[PDB]
Design a protein around this ligand. Structure first.
Ligand code: NAG
Ligand code: NAG
Ligand code: NAG
Ligand code: NAG
Ligand code: NAG
Ligand code: NAG
Lengths: 596, 99
């Protein structure tokens, strides 16, 4: 009869056939990931082509139902999600060119092999050949050689490709009634039609700048401390007044600073909280790790894992004969099928990763009652944030003492909390200016504020201004230095890590206030608290049915992303860094004083 | 995937109790006539459940048998079995033989 009932029946048929087809595609991807064989690749490609053709046909059929004659918010949300053209609005030649460009960037990044000139008989790939060198070497010119040679090869291959990529993506985005591709990425946080809880695409950049202005003193003090410690490690290269050299940050790009914990430890004489040896002494299998994680999730009041989870997941490396991807991934295959693909070792990192991926599984299980096209996070930040809060809670010494992994006579003094908080800041705080600078640069590239001949002159200017990192030698416009990273070269949004980082500590403060924890925020554990799990599950059950602002009101009581929980989390470390930076100079100079 | 089990997804009105609908006529959700072709706004009523062994317990196939017991004015003849206490002779007992 009416247009709304027609759209509801069309959505019902859509949902029903989509769930099955997404299941078939996801199962083919699972069979590829646990068994890398060419027929599984062919089955994955066939299932993916069927899934994409089905999404094309339902996008073609959904647009015939006009939006303004539908009043139900969930139906309008699913119809808005379905009616996106995607690349279909672009011409077939340009769509084929864009797909070819994306695939060849994927092959260039995946099969990029770089080694030393005059010794070409064998070469090292990025993972794990160059990752281990970047994370463990202490030699200045070796890291400089690896950094400059990999940005030479990758940038000189990818620069015309990226110049075509920006034009094609801007053409596709303006064909979809967006200002640029940056506006297309910012449209994930756009809320329209809800009274009071509306969020705009232009408000996101203002909120990011407003939060980063409060991030900036803590990052300045951390940068000054890391600069002083790297001056101790490398005597003559680092200047007291200037920025950090780019190849000394412990990773290939500067994404994380967590590989500088050995060099920048405050109290080396004090012990670590490493529990690896205790699990080796008690012979903890990966099955015991996941059972302890399940005990953690039933302690907070969340549902326990299904029988199909234990039957169908691969929680151990299969062997030499069978090849599998080693990266830990939680799979919501559909139809109540939840799996974890992780090559779990007996380490603390794999235990925290198991908690993180089982948090992903719990988030996927919570919105199983929702319709298929609403089975996602409210934004891209929440899905990672609910895993990162489990990574926060599981890492606490109280959790290790509670499960018996730590000695009951372990002395928790202020020095171990300071160095633990510094490690968490090097992991968490250090990625924030890099993420903000990368996303702001990509937004200015898509918006056309920066011309193609001035991309790099601005970019290093941004890096000195924001990240406080100086280039070793100047780069001309033949280089493509951003696109050596995985997410930017393979068309992925990058603001999800910034939003995840802020939502992580907002959720942590909300659940610790729910759990009535009476100490420091980093000393807080959300185990044994049913009310914290209920407050979590109220947001978890919504999925994408409700706006992320309303979900954030449901958790923390605020209508916007907030920066104060992060600063409250690192406040002992902030006071300690302010005490330690009395003699030294906080802040950096954009001049060429260290090296150029 | 077992596609042999189907379910009726649409119909203009709800079913009466103990009604069976085996019609395979194209559901008309819109004002336009379907004319027997599953085009725009016209969908097929019966949809399969792709039953796979790796499914969740809320999606696994369940065989359901519903037994309906009615009493009508005719004499009821499908009676549940009664038991037989071991016969005792030569003693004063309370006997119940076939009512
Ligand atoms: C992985 O693929 C190989 C190749 O045929 C096959 O022999 C093996 O059984 C597969 N592994 C599993 C667990 O089925
Ligand atoms: C919107 O539709 C859903 C089913 O798709 C229904 O449960 C819900 O009550 C509807 N909301 C309104 C306000 O009509
Ligand atoms: C998708 O593209 C078609 C033309 O190819 C256009 O008519 C339609 O409005 C587009 N969809 C949206 C949501 O703008
Ligand atoms: C999950 O918990 C329920 C109730 O405590 C229990 O019956 C079920 O066996 C548990 N699941 C597993 C896989 O142990
Ligand atoms: C830890 O506490 C003691 C006594 O309260 C103090 O002397 C010491 O400086 C503190 N250390 C740090 C790193 O705050
Ligand atoms: C939380 O509950 C588990 C299971 O009852 C128990 O073993 C653990 O000791 C509890 N935690 C605390 C801090 O008491």
């Amino acid at each position: 009869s009416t247009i709304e009932e027609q759209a509801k029946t069309f959505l019902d048929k859509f949902n029903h056939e989509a769930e099955d087809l997404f299941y078939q595609s996801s199962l083919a991807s699972w069979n590829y990931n646990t068994n890398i064989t060419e027929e599984n690749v062919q089955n994955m490609n066939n299932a993916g082509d069927k899934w994409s053709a089905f999404l094309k046909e339902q996008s073609t059929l959904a647009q015939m139902y006009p939006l303004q004659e539908i009043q139900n918010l969930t139906v309008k949300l699913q119809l808005q999600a379905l009616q996106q053209n995607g690349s279909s609005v672009l011409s077939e030649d340009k769509s084929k060119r864009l797909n070819t460009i994306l695939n060849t960037m994927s092959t260039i990044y995946s099969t990029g092999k770089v080694c030393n000139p005059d010794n070409p008989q064998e070469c090292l790939l990025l993972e794990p050949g160059l990752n281990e060198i970047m994370a463990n070497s202490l030699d200045y010119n070796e890291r400089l050689w690896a950094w400059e040679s990999w940005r030479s090869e990758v940038g000189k291959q990818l620069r015309p490709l990226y110049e075509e990529y920006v034009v094609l993506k801007n053409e596709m985005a303006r064909a979809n009634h967006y200002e640029d591709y940056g506006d297309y990425w910012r449209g994930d946080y756009e809320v329209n039609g809800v009274d009071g809880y509306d969020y705009s695409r232009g408000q996101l950049i203002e909120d990011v700048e407003h939060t980063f202005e409060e991030i900036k003193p803590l990052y300045e003090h951390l940068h000054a401390y890391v600069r002083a410690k790297l001056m101790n490690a490398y005597p003559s290269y680092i200047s007291p007044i200037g920025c950090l050299p780019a190849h000394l940050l412990g990773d290939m790009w500067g994404r994380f600073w967590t590989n500088l914990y050995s060099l920048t430890v405050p109290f080396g004489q004090k012990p670590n909280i490493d529990v690896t040896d205790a699990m080796v002494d008690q012979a903890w299998d990966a099955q015991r790790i996941f059972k302890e994680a399940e005990k953690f999730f039933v302690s907070v009041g969340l549902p326990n894992m299904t029988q199909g989870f234990w039957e169908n997941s691969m929680l151990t490396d299969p062997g030499n004969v069978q090849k599998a991807v080693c990266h830990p991934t939680a799979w919501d295959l559909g139809k109540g099928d939840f799996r974890i693909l992780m090559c779990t070792k007996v380490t603390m990192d794999d235990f925290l990763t198991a908690h993180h991926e089982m948090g992903h599984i719990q988030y996927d299980m919570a919105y199983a009652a929702q319709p298929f096209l609403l089975r996602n996070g409210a934004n891209e930040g929440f899905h990672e944030a609910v895993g990162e809060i489990m990574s926060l809670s599981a890492a606490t010494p109280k959790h290790l003492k509670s499960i018996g992994l730590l000695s009951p006579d372990f002395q928790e003094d202020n020095e171990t909390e300071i160095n633990f908080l510094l490690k968490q800041a090097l992991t968490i705080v250090g990625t924030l200016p890099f993420t903000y600078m990368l996303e702001k640069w990509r937004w200015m590239v898509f918006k056309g504020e920066i011309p193609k001949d001035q991309w790099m002159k601005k970019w290093w200017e941004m890096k000195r201004e924001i990240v406080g990192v100086v280039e070793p030698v100047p780069h001309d416009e033949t280089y493509c230095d951003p696109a050596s990273l995985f997410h930017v070269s393979n068309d992925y949004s990058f603001i999800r890590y910034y939003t995840r980082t802020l939502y992580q500590f907002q959720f942590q403060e909300a659940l610790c206030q729910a759990a009535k924890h009476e100490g420091p925020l980093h000393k807080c554990d959300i185990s044994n608290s049913t009310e914290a799990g209920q407050k979590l599950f109220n947001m978890l059950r919504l999925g994408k049915s409700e706006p992320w602002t309303l979900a954030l009101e449901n958790v923390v009581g605020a209508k916007n992303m907030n920066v104060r929980p992060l600063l409250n989390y690192f406040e002992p470390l902030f006071t300690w860094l302010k005490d330690q930076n009395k003699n030294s100079f906080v802040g950096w100079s954009t001049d060429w004083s260290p090296y150029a | 995937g077992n596609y042999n089990y189907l379910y009726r997804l649409f119909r203009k009105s709800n079913l009466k109790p103990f009604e069976r609908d085996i019609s395979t006529e194209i559901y008309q959700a819109g004002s336009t006539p379907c004319n027997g072709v599953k085009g725009f706004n016209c969908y097929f009523p019966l949809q399969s459940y792709g039953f796979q062994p790796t499914y969740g317990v809320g999606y696994q196939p369940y065989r359901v048998v519903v037994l309906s017991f009615e009493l009508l004015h005719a004499p009821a003849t499908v009676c549940g079995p009664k038991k037989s206490t071991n016969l005792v002779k030569n003693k004063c007992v309370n006997f119940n033989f076939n009512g």
